[model samples]
Target: QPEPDMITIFIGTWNMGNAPPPKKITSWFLSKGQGKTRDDSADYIPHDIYVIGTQEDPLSEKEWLEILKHSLQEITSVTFKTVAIHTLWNIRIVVLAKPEHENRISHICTDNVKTGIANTLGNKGAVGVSFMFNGTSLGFVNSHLTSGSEKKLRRNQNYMNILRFLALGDKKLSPFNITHRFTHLFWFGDLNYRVDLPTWEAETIIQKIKQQQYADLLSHDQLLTERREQKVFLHFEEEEITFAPTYRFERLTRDKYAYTKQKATGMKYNLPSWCDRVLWKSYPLVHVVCQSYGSTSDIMTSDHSPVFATFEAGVTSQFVSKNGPGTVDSQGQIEFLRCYATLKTKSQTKFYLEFHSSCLESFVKSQEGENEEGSEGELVVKFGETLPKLKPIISDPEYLLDQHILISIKSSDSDESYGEGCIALRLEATETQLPIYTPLTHHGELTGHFQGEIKLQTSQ
Candidate 1:
């Protein structure tokens, strides 16, 4: 009933099998009558965010992104920006948000993990896009997992590796050992988990689905089976399937599943499973409302039906920190660093440049390599990684006066502080202007530096 504080999110996932999008995709992005003339209707709320993820999306990036940009405009009816986009070969994830909300977005970050052969190839992998809105943290992950019903165990491993390796948020600020720490997370793509049946048996499942009967067939869906009986995606929740399976479609037909010519003696229909999916996990405070969940059966350009879900999410609290451990009241903006720069990193080494002020509770725990070998050795600070427009709350300006905010470099596993850094602000003087310089160090060498400013709002 008019959840005023929530923001609408439209998330879609598809395994395009390297196929191009059809001329119109509104059926996937819009509800019953929202697309015809771009009519401004009171019944429709603007989509605050559009997260579109695809697998084997073989195309020039410009053409692929343009299709989504144009389709989103048709549905959102507002100007937007492609805030973040991550692609690992053909696995691409695009996150678009309204330009008006740009001021409220913070902590932008992206990362990817390869689960392909030898864990070095991008053919089968996942990409993650994470950021904070208002006061809540959110993550969008797009992935292509192991296929084949028998490879189900391996698929579970892929999920595990993604959680283990795909670092969301900034490495210094969030927990990295696991990926689900965000208050809200949206995961989608060609998960490749099939129906729990032999290749010969999908025909019976298809017959039942044709009759609009899913209960009997759904009991054998591998993803659900694994979720209930195993450890993979156990905490995640998916919408009830009101649509047919999303996989094994014949590219030429909108409603036909592709029976293949590979199995043994003759051409026969293989398993039809819901390989493409959209799923999420969130905390209770989010009060996230699921708006709609459906598949775009009208578009047959891809071998997998495009799947989508819509939701309204966030907190109703009066005040909170988007760079947070929890919700609070009376927040303020602190663009801590415009940029940090340096070198000597071995392409992908890990370290943290931590900040704790008279204001902060403590340095945020590094979200990487807590249980590994190099956790404590050196502060592998990569200056290139996007530092926060780090938003925070100043609880009591009275008590925090003249206290120096602290900064240091440390390995996630080791508590020994390495890179020496700090920022001091004396609030006793009149607040006209303030800038902080941090000589971010690495083993006594001047490896990195960043300048920060506190833009004070003048009262009228």
Candidate 2:
């Protein structure tokens, strides 16, 4: 843990059915691998990204897939895949993409019906998938909400209308070009709210993840403030901050003054806060270093604790060219070259030469009251239709930031005959916020949750 221009994350949040011995859950990743790089490091691996959403009970056959394949094979020589949906319900979501991005991963599932209500689950939990590495386009999300009261405020307004149908809808789910740019997004799970409230009434769902500028890798001054004194913890309660007694009412009777009288009788009838979280949104390459929260002594063996961060990958500028599509006259320079003339074919002109290499010459083109085509012939891009409102080129001073700046669309050069034509690279960044929670991190698990991790300081 050195920090030479920082990048070292490792977050935690567990319940493992709140083990008294739910078959022990191998001491919460052998106590969060003694501050990472441990299952005896061969440069220890696992977790480039692993989010296991709200699990509980029913797990036994193969003991919940060998407790998630021996917790990522003891934290490093990794490999996994769980995302299930056959039994119908089990608190879904399971992913573990880290071994060099496991072939550019993919996973999706979220749509809790809550936006402007009249049957709003339309935004369905923000899920999008697309890839191309050198052609740039990435979006990954995993979410779980829509808990109690007021159906948790319409599933947190259908998770901000699935984060405005994936960062400002329009043009088949905004694949960025706002003013002239593209897309690159990533969202982690469990965002149960907290941080002093007040985003149109914050009681939970982290006030709809603080509306966009997303980056709260657990910074309430980064916790660890020392302060554990109820005079060294005897019958503690400076507003109940014992820090050692993570959840006890399994059915009472373990005795510690009857577990401090069932924790003051379940805080006068249910109330324990925090709920587990880890949220992020970074670009300018990408950075996030929040390295701690496995909290030693092997994470008290698990009562909900797991959060780690460390991913510092940057420097990738190489897509240059500002003046090439024109012509040069007398001696001044470029004067004309707008000559769209590159196309080759074999059969069916190789399907119209892969549809004119992503066709970008449109003087005007708006025709979508609705349509359908996707068998991969490309056309499922319509979650909210990627931005256009009154478009004469977005006035009102770039619309004073609620979120918008997707120029329009234009970028395509790779072609083995359109590579297989499914190119939809659209993005315009700046729309962070996506965390929410309030007494919903785990219910069938062990019953303790609320954690986070992130890092991204950009300059490009």
Candidate 3:
């Protein structure tokens, strides 16, 4: 189904650099601008889930958890439950879910890989957690890879190592291949892939950040370079690097890149890199959209600052049991659906869909990218799916189920109303990939056949 069901996710990753957790710095939700801002108000959309990862994290596991939940409460009103947490050498990955959404997240698992110091010591490596949300699975990896500029190969190799060894799901029910097992997986934190330029040359360009020359400098990023050649991050995608590099910030300095000779290893890297990053890849059945990607300058407790992003991850709504307390009652089940539709008329034109629910008022319109006509001969509109993209009209209170949606289609010019249909919100169909057909009508006459599937689904 083209229409998608989504849950908001807020992600933040930082390398504490072995520095102790500060006394009162809990602005985890306060990402400033793209290239990251510090909005004091709850101006942005609150998240349905929060995932925080750290490398060389200094806080004890229990203490950080307190800080994590405490900070969240201060920022947003929507409640969240800790989904999972794991640490290896202070490398930690934490997943939290809002049980109110009742995603029925399960199969939660944790794993780690010791690719540091002969692949034996846990002093520097990766720690990860994977879980099934609704039916879609996701993995989060927090790692502190080799930090030297010369260790680019090692950093990429470490990813391969984690991919090979990190078993994320049940042995019998899931595949051991990391990427294959989950519908989407996020790899982040202190990846340590430095810019592939000499310090003087790189620092010369690092000053470009001061000039807001982020676009040109991105070509020098090791991760970006490696990813383009498919040497690393196979088939993975990153939102554009519109922001400045998030690595090697001087302690207590705002937007200043670190540049000084260290006594122990003067030859080691101090050059700028996008060391801190958040990246995710999803299966074709699902989609993840990054709404905001930026870093913060509010905290300078560590040499490395924080990088955060907000994502709208497509989800599949399920008919979950309501026996547990605070769970969704059977009558209050949240149902979502999606399917394909073809106008039964001979015109063969695309359309825009408008709809509203019985429990709510004002008509909600689908987004504007549905059916375009490019796929005909030149692969015209996003693989030639000619249709007006409509976003689901959502009224206040909830986008939950228990009411029928009066859906209607319209022409591009808004001069004509094609047809109207009312689909009941109820659960009766068996779980299968089978395509179902529903009829649309106007004045007791058939209008069209919607040939799509119910997902309750993905952005795509």
Candidate 4:
């Protein structure tokens, strides 16, 4: 993998407290009331990808999808579109990406883990989804864990459960656990780990937070302590939490603290803590930079404020549109053009490709039973027992084509791996239109070959 120009990603998480969405929930995603002054202008720059997670979402699954889609189009001028949606009981995660880069995203797979009761109920659990983006694998997990001031060990157990059972139901598609599968992974939700301190002591630290004495309070954060002790989220990294706590606020406004009510009624309550959070882990070669990390207090729909983090990742850029497909020269010999070649794990394999030349008029054709191809633009190739076949996208119509071929090699129980023959392209051309009784035939023919390799890692 190589580093390239940066691409921005936006992530938001909220625990809605089992309440319906507000009149205009889109404002929360677009920074509507976050302006500093009455005359402050809206600084809205749509990111390449938008990921939003909700715990205890009250709206029906159908309603949630429809409303969120409509709102995103309204705000971003329809630049972004929903690519993946997953919901398991109260935990939901949705991914929206730009349309121009849609085809680059594939191999969409999802899984969930129930840590509530004998690992069968949805009351407390996690939902995860993963896919390939720009030839790089990315995974996201949104979870709602057990809640209690002293349930620290239970929270750690819930996280481990998520790692063990989060599969796409198809064991072949998910050969490795989430943390080991993707180059970059994100985990976020209402983790419910409270401050590890006495009530009066935690309150005093909260009071001192206004004077920028927050570093001392972070030492008592249960999540940070677990990371240090290697109890859970072993390699995940979190941005510094410079803002005040994001949980236990008033029902409709952030002015009053909910812990005050707990003190008045003598009811058990966890001290205000940074319970809602987002953390990420990247491979050795990949670099993830955090731009901003904080809570959005302007939104008062839940007792826990929404937390958001903006980040950019460095990824290798594949073939550009100008780099067309393999060309067939005057001698009818096919010379392949390549950008880069590298192999990774998982049953699914992707080949970065390019193709171009005047000979395409006779070589590429629209085959029956295969969609996503046209007479003059795209080409389709069907190979061995791949879980998903190939859909070659033609980025440049003027100059032949460029595409990424994603395939799954069929393997037997005894076989360590499988292989596919080099792609074969035959050219055919005709100028006359076919009449009711007339037959059409190609006058010329040419052939070409594009080659690649794939290897699978051994199971431990």
Worst 10 contiguous positions by lDDT, candidate 1: 31-40
lDDT of 4 by residue, 1-460 (tens): 3433466777778899887766666655653332111111433466677788899898876788777777777766765767788888889998888787687677788778889575436498888878767646678889998887778899988888887678742244322346545556888999988777787775685586556566777898999998888777875799888777877887788775676435543466767788998999765436688776777767787888878776787544443332223432221222222111111223333222222222242222111111223244433223212211122222232111211121122223322222211121211211211111101010100111222322111110
- Per-residue lDDT value at 350 in model 3: 50
Better of 1 and 2 by TM-score: 1
Global lDDT of each candidate: 0.64, 0.29, 0.63, 0.59
lDDT of 2 by residue, 1-460 (tens): 1212221222334333333324334444433332332243423544445444432224543455666666667655566544332111333334444445444333333322123444644322433322323223333344444432223345445444444454321244223211112233344333332222222332232332323222331232111111122111111111111122222223322111111224544332212223333343332223333333332234333333333323332212112222211311111110111111111221121111111111111122222212234453432212123222221111111111111112111223222211111111111322222221111111111111111111111111
Instruction: Give the RMSD in angstroms, all C-alphas superposed, for model 2.
Output: 22.1
- Estimate the TM-score of every prediction: 0.67, 0.26, 0.66, 0.64
> lDDT at 125 for candidate 1?
84
Displacement of residue 89 (Cα, Å) in model 1 is 0.5
* Candidate 1: segments with Cα more than 4 A from true spot: 1-4, 31-44, 119-122, 173-178, 261-269, 316-360, 363-460
Q: How many residue pairs clash in each candidate?
A: 4, 77, 23, 8
lDDT of 3 by residue, 1-460 (tens): 2322677777788888788766655555666645544345645456777889888788888888888777766666556688888888688888877666444688789999888564535576788888766645667777777777777788787878777687776454221256544556777778887677776685687678778787666777888988877667765667776676777777776667765567755556577777888888665435578877777767677878788877778765432332312222233322224544455455545566565432332455544325433333211112123332322323211233323445566566653545555453332432323343445543323456454433231111
lDDT tens digits, residue span 1-460, model 1: 2323678888888888777778998777773321111223623456888888888898766787788888767765676787888888888888888787676688888899999575535488899899877646789889899877677888888887887688885465332233334657888888988777666666777797677777876788888888888457745778787677777877868667775656541454447787888788774334676777767767888878888788878632223234334632244333342333232333344555555542454554433322122354432334332444333344333322323444555554465444444454443232344655655543323444445454321111
> Candidate 3: where is the Cα deviation over 4 Å?
1-4, 24-26, 33-45, 101-103, 116-120, 173-176, 319-460
